[PDB]
């Protein structure tokens, strides 16, 4: 029984089940990627993820057509490409490469960014469906203020109220505790499995593999099927570590941290190019994104966990995340994706990479791109950029 196969089947099952619910008159939701999924899972609701779908279509080279449809309706090319792909999808009545049913309700949390607020405002208005908002206000202070904790808990309560109406069911505290226990263990398995590259030379996997498995923890964090999927993946990874094997091909000459999400329309090319130079991503911040740890029935801790996702903490803490990933990852360099869609990450990248370089003493380089819009990435430039980083790292190896 192969992990990659179980995982692919599981992901396809989520889409299939949502289509079946649609046919039978049960409500389907669309959700941001770090929303408190526990709440809707208590009601056994089918929830899909527009970011996951856009990344999927982009990898199949189908995002450009959808973006162009959105732009013809008047959406500026400046907006996030996940949003443009999604608006194109709605206008087109779906797509061929990776279809999913329209939503009956929306779940929005701005811990990742504030663009999702405006994005979901538009869907709510145009489809006339309820919008559930969990506003995690940005943390300037090192710690989450009590005021933020209280306000998030109050929004948990409003969310449950609206979900009871949507589902036609009453909140079940007994099923809720069961959901919190499953979600906690899956968070732990995500952080453990994806952190294995750090203390393993060479690493048991190609670094890009993380972004495939990411789809699982995003869309099924509260499912027991996810528990078994990750346990099987862990068995395979640990087996590699013991026999010096990996899905990465060739000699692991250099270890790096890549800042940002991959350019999905070019994922295959990026994998070939790094591997050709003997470069592997062994340090990452993403193992921490969906760890989301809190004690059972502790709503205070759950609020803190969702509030402190690394896109929503001060620049000192953001920087510490990258520094710790490089050091603990035993990395020789850092490689930065200036992602045209993601303003939150892009507008503090200059200061963050200066600090990370000063503290670690490690060299860095970067390239321009986008996670879903193929017009923003240039193959020839990506190649020369990593070649330059490799030359610096090679010279520094000499004693």
């Amino acid at each position: 029984k192969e992990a990659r196969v179980v995982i692919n089947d599981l992901l396809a099952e989520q889409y299939a089940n949502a289509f079946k619910a649609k046919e039978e008159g049960r409500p389907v939701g669309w959700s941001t990627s770090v929303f408190p999924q526990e709440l809707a899972e208590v009601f056994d609701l089918n929830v899909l993820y527009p970011e996951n779908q856009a990344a999927g279509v982009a990898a199949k080279k189908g995002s450009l057509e959808l973006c162009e449809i959105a732009e013809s309706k008047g959406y500026s090319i400046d907006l996030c490409a996940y949003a443009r792909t999604n608006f194109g999808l709605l206008e087109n009545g779906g797509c061929e490469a990776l279809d999913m049913p329209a939503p009956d309700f929306l779940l929005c949390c701005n811990n990742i960014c504030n663009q999702v607020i405006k994005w979901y405002e538009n869907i709510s208005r145009e489809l006339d469906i309820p919008l559930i908002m969990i506003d995690t206000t940005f943390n300037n202070e090192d710690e989450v203020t009590q005021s933020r904790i209280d306000y998030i808990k109050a929004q948990f309560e409003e969310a449950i109220k609206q979900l009871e109406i949507i589902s036609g069911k009453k909140f079940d505290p007994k099923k809720f505790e069961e959901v919190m226990k499953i979600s906690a263990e899956n968070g732990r398995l995500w952080k453990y499995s994806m952190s294995l590259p750090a203390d393993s030379s060479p690493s048991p996997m190609n670094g890009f593999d993380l972004f495939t498995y990411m789809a699982v923890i995003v869309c099924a964090r509260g499912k027991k099927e996810t528990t078994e999927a990750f346990k099987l993946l862990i068995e395979e990874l640990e087996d590699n570590m013991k026999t010096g094997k990996s899905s990465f091909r060739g000699e692991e000459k250099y270890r790096i941290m890549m800042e940002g999400i991959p350019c999905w329309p070019y994922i295959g090319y990026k994998m070939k190019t790094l591997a050709k130079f003997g470069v592997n991503m062994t340090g990452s911040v993403y193992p921490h994104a969906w760890a989301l740890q809190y004690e059972v029935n502790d709503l205070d801790g759950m609020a803190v966990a969702y509030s402190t996702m690394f896109n929503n903490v001060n620049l000192d803490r953001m920087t510490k995340y990258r520094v710790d990933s490089l050091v603990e990852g035993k990395c020789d360099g850092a490689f930065y994706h200036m992602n045209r869609s993601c303003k939150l990450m892009s507008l503090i990248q200059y200061e963050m990479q200066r600090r990370a370089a000063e503290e670690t003493g490690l060299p860095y380089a970067g390239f321009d791109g986008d996670q879903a819009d193929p017009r923003a990435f240039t193959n020839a430039q990506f190649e020369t950029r990593i070649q330059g980083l490799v030359e610096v790292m090679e010279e520094r190896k000499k004693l």
Binding site: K73, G74, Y75, S76, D78, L79, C80, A83, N110, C113, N114, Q115, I117, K118, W119, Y120, E121, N122, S124, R125, E126, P130, L131, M133, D135, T137, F138, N140, E141, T145, Q146, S147, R148, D150, Y151, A154, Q155, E158, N314, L315, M338, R340, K343, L344, S346, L347, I348, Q349, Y350, E351
Partner: protein, 373 residues
Amino acid sequence: MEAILSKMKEVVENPNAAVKKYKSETGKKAIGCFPVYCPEEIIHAAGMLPVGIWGGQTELDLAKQYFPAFACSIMQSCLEYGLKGAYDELSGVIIPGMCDTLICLGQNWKSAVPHIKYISLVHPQNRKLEAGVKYLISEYKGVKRELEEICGYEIEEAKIHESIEVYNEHRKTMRDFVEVAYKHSNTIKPSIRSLVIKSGFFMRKEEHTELVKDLIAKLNAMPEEVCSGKKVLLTGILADSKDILDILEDNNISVVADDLAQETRQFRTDVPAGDDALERLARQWSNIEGCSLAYDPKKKRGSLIVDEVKKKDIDGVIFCMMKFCDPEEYDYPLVRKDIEDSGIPTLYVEIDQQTQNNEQARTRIQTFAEMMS
């Protein structure tokens, strides 16, 4: 009019002079307020001067160390000015995290301009929940605590109430101005309308109230006017550049209403009444409507623009789109459709504070006036 217009012209064109003048005469400090909404009443209560920060016509150089090319124009200008020390006479600045770019600017600011205290403030999206109101009160208490550390003395509750009354009086007066400007659209050119409104950002509100009430008196003395050209409503972040305002007038266009963050968005919603001063302010945010930065799944912005158009028989709506403003960009398609579904023509014009060439706006506005017949 000239005595009043010239006074407003001196503070708008020499903002820094006005600040240094205020600090020496009162012996009090000044605090900068970034867009879009700050609780100015708290600063005012301390006896300090709330000064509006809205960028300006500048080229980029120093800002390139912190922002790539695709941050919005206005925030690029604000950062460049800060780095050049144009704000150094301020004892602090409130930079509300209303969007990703405002949030990033604040974080960069702590390093880029370490000698000017940055005071944090994040308004709640869920602003109509009682929990949202209670949260925003806590944020305002934080803002109060920081201001008190700066000025050196406590800000009394009774003083905040007085400030709130002063500001509501100002908002009423500005709305009175809008109506009298609409009834004399030939005398009050677009460049004049903008000057009267923008002037409020560089002087105490009670002092600006007296200036505008003096201008209203003088206009009412004059007879109402029948607009000789076309009327429009302007909507967007701002439209205060000399160049854009000159083009409007050259095509025989008068602005008689706006949904601009820098203008009417500031005074169309009053602060509610109440025993608790910080509670009053917080409930004002509950009541804001028709703004791209104010959460509303129903997006009433379009319908509200239509109402104003019909009240004043306006001939067209011009979207003054800030370059790379994602909130306004998300709004554009749905708001445009609401307006055009009511038989009102619209125009798209880009606003770029880094340009030395506004030929696109010149030819588009030319074609838009001819299209108006």
